[PDB]
Write a protein that binds this ligand. Structure first.
Ligand SMILES: C=Cc1cccc(CC(=O)N2CCC[C@H](C(N)=O)C2)n1
Ligand SMILES: [Zn+2]
Length: 138
């Protein structure tokens, strides 16, 4: 679990969005596993606007942060799950690192700000949904 709080927006994994996120829907994209909802309170976070390929992510299944080298956002095949059919997820970045299903929502940050959130993983890999291209969040 986890979310990004920027301005009057809350960014979460689309597959983990609550009834309240859907009732205050701003934008969603199944192909990116992202959903953005509106908030009444002003958020705590700032978004990176950069091309960093190194950063640090929070891994809830280890209660720890780990440094990572990650690939550029791209279209990656993701096997079927209880949440989505087998499909290509876009704007996804992969890295070598530990992750388990409940780790989705953990923030990936570089020196410039928030880069994205954990969205996929398995077998020593961790995948992050990029948010740096969503300029309207600012
Ligand atoms: C087994 C490790 C692991 C680590 C991290 C996450 C997962 C689960 C996973 O990747 N899913 C299920 C939820 C929706 C995801 C998607 N973006 O399509 C795909 N599994
Ligand atoms: Zn950066």
């Amino acid at each position: 679990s986890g979310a990004i709080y920027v301005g009057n927006y809350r960014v979460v994994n689309r597959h983990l969005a609550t009834h309240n996120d859907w009732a205050n829907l701003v934008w969603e994209d199944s192909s990116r596993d992202l959903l953005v909802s509106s908030t009444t309170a002003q958020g705590c976070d700032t978004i990176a606007r950069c091309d960093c390929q190194t950063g640090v992510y929070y891994c809830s299944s280890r209660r720890k942060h780990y440094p990572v080298s990650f690939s550029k956002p791209s279209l990656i095949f993701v096997e079927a799950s209880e949440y989505y059919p087998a499909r290509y997820q876009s704007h996804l970045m992969l890295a070598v690192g530990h992750s388990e299903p409940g780790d989705c929502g953990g923030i990936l940050r570089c020196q410039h700000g928030v880069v994205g959130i954990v969205s996929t993983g398995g077998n020593g890999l961790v995948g992050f949904a990029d948010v740096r291209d969503l300029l309207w969040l600012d």
